[PDB]
Design an enzyme around this catalytic site. Structure first.
Site, PDB file in Angstrom:
ATOM      1  N   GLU A 165      -8.505  -4.874   6.950  1.00  0.00           N
ATOM      2  CA  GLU A 165      -9.277  -3.657   6.776  1.00  0.00           C
ATOM      3  C   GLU A 165     -10.287  -3.475   7.885  1.00  0.00           C
ATOM      4  O   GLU A 165     -10.619  -2.340   8.233  1.00  0.00           O
ATOM      5  CB  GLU A 165      -9.958  -3.671   5.414  1.00  0.00           C
ATOM      6  CG  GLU A 165      -8.939  -3.756   4.305  1.00  0.00           C
ATOM      7  CD  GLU A 165      -8.214  -2.454   4.134  1.00  0.00           C
ATOM      8  OE1 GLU A 165      -8.647  -1.487   4.797  1.00  0.00           O
ATOM      9  OE2 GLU A 165      -7.190  -2.398   3.405  1.00  0.00           O
TER      10      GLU A 165
ATOM     11  N   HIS B 146       1.129   3.176  -5.126  1.00  0.00           N
ATOM     12  CA  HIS B 146       1.565   4.073  -4.063  1.00  0.00           C
ATOM     13  C   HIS B 146       2.468   5.191  -4.563  1.00  0.00           C
ATOM     14  O   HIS B 146       2.460   6.290  -4.000  1.00  0.00           O
ATOM     15  CB  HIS B 146       2.214   3.227  -2.993  1.00  0.00           C
ATOM     16  CG  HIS B 146       1.336   2.107  -2.583  1.00  0.00           C
ATOM     17  ND1 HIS B 146       1.345   0.898  -3.230  1.00  0.00           N
ATOM     18  CD2 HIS B 146       0.423   1.990  -1.594  1.00  0.00           C
ATOM     19  CE1 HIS B 146       0.459   0.086  -2.687  1.00  0.00           C
ATOM     20  NE2 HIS B 146      -0.111   0.722  -1.682  1.00  0.00           N
TER      21      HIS B 146
END
Ligand SMILES: *[C@@H]1O[C@H](CO)[C@@H](O[C@@H]2O[C@H](CO)[C@@H](O)[C@H](O)[C@H]2NC(C)=O)[C@H](O)[C@H]1NC(C)=O
Ligand SMILES: *[C@@H]1O[C@H](CO[C@@H]2O[C@@H](C)[C@@H](O)[C@@H](O)[C@@H]2O)[C@@H](O)[C@H](O)[C@H]1NC(C)=O
Ligand SMILES: *[C@@H]1O[C@H](CO)[C@@H](O)[C@H](O)[C@H]1NC(C)=O
Lengths: 131, 595
Positions: free
Chosen positions: B357, B487
């Protein structure tokens, strides 16, 4: 008497490439473009002031000055150094010391946005007090 | 004046009004995602309705500016991008239905609860309870309660919504002149670009399949080895020739097998590659994790994180009782505001995740030098690959040592080499067949190769052939188990997580040769290699200004996916598994099932 000189850079940062350069950066010797010390004692301090932009990207925007073309360090001027004439200007004047004013986004690109101009005749009439 | 000049007028206008509306939409998505409250939902919607308005209007005011007639290949790029897009070609009524379906699927997922049949007041959400079961538990029947409860009591709810959702996104697709939503998505991978650099969107499938076939053997052997061990833990539940029961794999899905490391480590007496236990023994807090990640990024010559990042990231689940979204994301709010959102826990997983990240934030910082329309990663794989490159260097036992999380007397030997490449296969090689199948299903449902009356039939027909994983319990078409994964219910292309994986080794090879590393690349830790830092930063800062094919040629040799660095990373492991499997039955049968 004793004269204070605030040398202030005020900058606004938006525009097209927020990160590449500041948008506008106004430069001022006491709210004017030129000050000559006329008192026995003088102080000069550099003040950096951002405008509000609604983005914490401010404060990664650093505008500061650099060691220029002259035997003074800005900080050395206030430390009991002595002159006969000493004058400060915003724009290049004849035969001057130049303290260049560099701006930078969190130490990526560096981009010069002005300079402080110093003119001096050595003497023992004007003093730089640091207080 | 020249139509190209007159279109620069347009671009300049866009690139001013946008950077205010973007930041203000981003700032309100932040607040919701950091404080879910009905009045923060409202504010979020409003500001994004301001953005949508502008963007879809300026898309249409940009189609008025024909592309052949423009010659500057920046103003062409920028315009092309504005023009193309827009779920905007739909009835005001049908646009509004989609967004209710979408927001409903999202919050059904967000808020779904599966409830102890013993204590009906005890009722559990994925985050935080059901995922914790499925990550930690070894109890076959507790795993199945959770695994089934989620699919039966939220997947079912999702099914009617999902059906409308495919209808309307297929409509949005064909009315922006694509074949089906599946095609709409595959066009993150379209380059027009220069000569010798183009790539069509029907070659993604071909090349995904080509490169997947080449993985299939390394994956088959990994599979054999882990069913072999899992029997030691669930004897009488696991057939040494069938697929692997789905509830037993580490996730609520088996997206990654990583959490199966406990049970499958080859040489366990050695010092633990999984450094979770060391982290906890040394009182590592989330701040420690992110600082160490920062320091990695600095050592390769890439910037440290901005003060604003440390002021406004959300690096743990807040203690003030606020309900927040934990799914780890790396926000570019624009105007140099960069943040992370991440409910961090002390786990080698969130340590690697923090590196990933923060890698996102670095590509984000780098391309802010590019015009607004071009400040996106080249494809969706590039962004997530740059993230995973950091994990590659940060998980090698060498770097673990130099961080502190392996005792000072540690020294690699061929047994700990195999240990490492098993975990890093559970995580990497493991997610490859999952990612291919889920999206083949999606793409095919979208094409309409798979009607509603086979949605769960084909799913588990394909999960048993491609992936080697078997439902523990029969699932009728009252279920929509694909939509039981984040997702899918939140409407995100998934193929990115496949392309990322073939790239992350292509790229790592390159940087290691520039880091003048000799020897096996799984022993590459580009750490302290400012030269490799520069090479990477040079792509990062291009953003989308060039085709993704051209952007591969710059760092890596080729202009397309190449599975070879991935095979070489894992070659040690390939040979140990192939030995460790000779007297075993490698491959599965789609016929056995636990019921
Ligand atoms: C395409 O057009 C852009 C402007 O839209 C050009 O970018 C300018 O390049 C000159 C180079 O001397 C700079 O002085 C300007 O500041 C740039 N932008 C502006 C505001 O005009 C670009 O060079 C052109 N060429 C291509 C093909 O990229
Ligand atoms: C980030 O780092 C700042 C110091 O910058 C360091 O030196 C410059 C020249 C670059 O090489 C930069 O990458 C180096 O990190 C600190 O002043 C600043 O506080 C740091 N920001 C935070 C909060 O991490
Ligand atoms: C959360 O949002 C509410 C409004 O929905 C607001 O009053 C509150 O101050 C916010 N809390 C924080 C700490 O952001």
């Amino acid at each position: 008497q004793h004269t204070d000189i605030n040398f202030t850079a005020t900058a606004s940062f938006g525009g097209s490439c927020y990160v590449c350069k500041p948008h506008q950066v106004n430069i001022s010797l006491n709210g004017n473009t030129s000050v000559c010390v006329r008192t026995s004692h003088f102080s000069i301090r550099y003040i950096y002031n951002r405008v509000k932009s609604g983005s914490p990207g401010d404060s990664s925007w650093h505008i500061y000055l650099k060691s220029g073309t002259c035997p003074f360090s800005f900080s050395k001027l206030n430390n009991f150094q002595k002159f006969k004439t000493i004058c400060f200007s915003t724009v290049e004047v004849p035969g001057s010391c130049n303290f260049p004013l560099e701006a930078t986004w969190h130490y990526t690109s560096y981009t010069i946005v002005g300079a402080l101009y110093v003119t001096w005749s050595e003497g023992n009439s004007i003093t730089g007090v640091p207080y | 004046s020249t139509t190209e000049d007159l279109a620069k007028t347009f671009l300049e206008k866009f690139n001013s009004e946008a950077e205010e509306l973007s930041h203000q939409s981003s700032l309100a998505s932040w607040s919701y995602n950091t404080n879910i409250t009905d009045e923060n939902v409202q504010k979020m919607n409003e500001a994004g309705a301001r953005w949508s308005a502008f963007y879809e209007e300026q898309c249409k005011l940009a189609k008025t500016y024909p592309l052949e007639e423009i010659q500057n290949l920046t103003v062409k790029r920028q315009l092309q991008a504005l023009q193309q897009s827009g779920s905007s070609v739909l009835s005001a009524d049908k646009s509004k239905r989609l967004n209710e379906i979408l927001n409903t699927m999202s919050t059904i997922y967000s808020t779904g609860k599966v409830c102890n049949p013993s204590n009906p007041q005890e009722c559990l959400l994925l985050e935080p309870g059901l995922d914790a079961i499925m990550e930690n538990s070894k109890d076959y029947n507790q795993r199945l309660w959770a695994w089934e409860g989620w699919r039966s009591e939220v997947g079912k709810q999702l099914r009617p919504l999902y059906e409308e959702y495919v209808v309307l996104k297929n409509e949005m697709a064909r009315a922006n002149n694509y074949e089906d939503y599946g095609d709409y998505w595959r066009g993150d991978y379209e380059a027009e670009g220069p000569s010798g650099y183009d790539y069509s969107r029907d070659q993604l499938i071909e090349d995904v399949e080509r490169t997947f076939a080449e993985i299939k053997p390394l994956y088959e052997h990994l599979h054999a080895y882990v069913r072999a061990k899992l029997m030691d833990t669930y004897p009488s539940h696991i057939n040494p020739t069938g697929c692997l029961p789905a509830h037993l794999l580490g996730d609520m899905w088996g997206r990654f097998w990583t959490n199966l490391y406990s049970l499958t480590v080859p040489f366990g007496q050695k010092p633990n590659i999984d450094v979770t236990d060391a982290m906890v023994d040394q009182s590592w807090d989330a701040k420690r994790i992110f600082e160490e990640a920062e320091k990695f990024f600095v050592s390769v010559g890439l910037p440290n994180m901005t003060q604003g990042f440390w002021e406004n990231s959300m690096l743990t689940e807040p203690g003030d009782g606020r309900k927040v979204v934990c799914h780890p994301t790396a926000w570019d709010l624009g105007k140099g505001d960069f943040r992370i959102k991440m409910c961090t826990k002390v786990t080698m997983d969130d340590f690697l995740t923090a590196h990933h990240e923060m890698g996102h934030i670095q590509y984000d910082m780098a391309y802010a030098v590019q015009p607004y329309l071009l400040r996106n990663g080249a494809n969706e794989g590039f962004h997530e690959a740059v993230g995973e490159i950091m994990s590659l260097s940060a998980a090698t036992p060498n770097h673990l040592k130099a961080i502190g999380l392996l005792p000072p007397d540690f020294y690699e030997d061929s047994e700990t080499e195999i240990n490492f490449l098993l975990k890093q296969a559970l995580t990497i090689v493991g997610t490859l067949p999952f990612t291919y199948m889920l999206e083949k299903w999606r793409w095919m449902v979208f094409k309409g190769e798979i009607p509603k009356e086979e949605w769960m039939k084909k799913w588990w027909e394909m999960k048993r052939e491609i992936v080697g994983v078997v439902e523990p319990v029969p699932h009728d078409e009252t279920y929509c188990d694909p939509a039981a994964l984040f997702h899918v219910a939140n409407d995100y292309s998934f193929i990115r997580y496949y392309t990322r994986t073939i790239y992350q080794f292509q790229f790592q090879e390159a940087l290691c040769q520039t880091a003048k590393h000799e020897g096996p690349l799984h022993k590459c830790d580009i750490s302290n290699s400012t030269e490799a830092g520069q090479k990477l930063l040079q792509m990062l800062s291009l953003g989308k200004s060039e085709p993704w094919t051209l952007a591969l040629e710059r760092i890596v040799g080729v202009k397309n996916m190449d599975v070879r660095p991935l095979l070489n990373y894992f070659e040690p492991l390939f040979t140990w598994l192939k030995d460790q499997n000779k007297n075993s039955f490698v491959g599965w049968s789609t016929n056995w099932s636990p019921y």
